[PDB]
Design a binder for this molecule. Structure first.
Ligand code: NI
Lengths: 9, 57
């Protein structure tokens, strides 16, 4: 996967 | 160690206490108020956005 990221609280 | 969202660009970067990069992410479909600082390991192949921010082109 590219150009995505996990997002934090 | 989070849900995946599409990244639009990288707004800023900085070093954490352990000397590794963290990036301020602009999330596609969201405004500046929702930007978050994320460590490298949370970015999945965002090299293009990192290069754009550093000026490599
Ligand atoms: Ni993590």
């Amino acid at each position: 996967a590219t150009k995505v990221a996990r997002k934090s609280a | 160690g989070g849900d995946l969202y599409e990244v639009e660009r990288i707004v800023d970067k900085r070093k954490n206490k352990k000397g590794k990069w963290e990036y301020l992410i602009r999330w596609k479909g969201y405004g500046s108020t929702e930007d978050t600082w994320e460590p490298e390991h949370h970015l999945l192949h965002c090299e293009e956005f990192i290069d754009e921010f550093n000026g490599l082109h």
